[PDB]
Design a protein around this ligand. Sequence first.
Ligand SMILES: O=C(CNc1cccc(Cl)c1)N[C@@H]1CCCN(c2ncnc3[nH]ccc23)C1
Length: 261
Amino acid sequence: WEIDPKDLTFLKELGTGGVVKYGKWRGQYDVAIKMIKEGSMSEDEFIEEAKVMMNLSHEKLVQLYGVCTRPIFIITEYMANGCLLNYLREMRHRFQTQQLLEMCKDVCEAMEYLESKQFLHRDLAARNCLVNDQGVVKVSDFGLSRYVLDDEYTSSVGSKFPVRWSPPEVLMYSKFSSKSDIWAFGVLMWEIYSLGKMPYERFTNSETAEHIAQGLRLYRPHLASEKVYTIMYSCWHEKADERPTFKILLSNILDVMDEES
Ligand SMILES: O=C(CNc1cccc(Cl)c1)N[C@@H]1CCCN(c2ncnc3[nH]ccc23)C1
């Protein structure tokens, strides 16, 4: 469960927000080293659950290799093409919709696995997915929000809360469940088919919440076929119990993949 930090070679910085670096493990294996900002996380709680998130293995989940326990380190799978949000916004890729659908299926596969384990992501969004050197999308930082201490992010009334990815029952009552992950998944499909535009682009968070409370929704990205739009729209039913499962969403996505080509 614990990785010896002396086995790490740091090679390049990948981002600061704490700090993420590219490096090697025992000379050979590529890794991401996440160096957590002091005071930013409930580290004891994180460490205890870290023991659980490593048994969470799936080809479409960014793999947790271990932790170093200042700053403590989270060592994970390295994803050469970075976060899905920036990849989507690189217009040079000139994606086909078949590739976009495959991105959606990648995430849906990961989320069905998490569902089968009764594990919530709680912050699913394109900014929390990564792309590897082969172009496969995997979902990262699942469950992480439970241990972030910043209160602009903890609470539904927070300036950093994922308002645009939250169902009505989350915005009004903080009711989290599998179906708030389902809702967020549908917004993620919208992000993917919109090549990474911000959901509810011309609205504030507060306008977005009123719009959702009123029963109005995101509409169809240009690159989305009717059958793809139907899939994402189904994640946004006002009644949580009316929303599909990730198993059902996976079948719907597989069906459309067949029908395109
Ligand atoms: O990992 C995050 C944010 N989450 C986070 C969570 C806990 C602690 C810390 Cl410090 C950060 N961002 C980085 C930015 C740079 C590009 N990234 C990667 N590139 C390439 N491979 C990779 N593997 C994992 C991340 C990764 C994502």
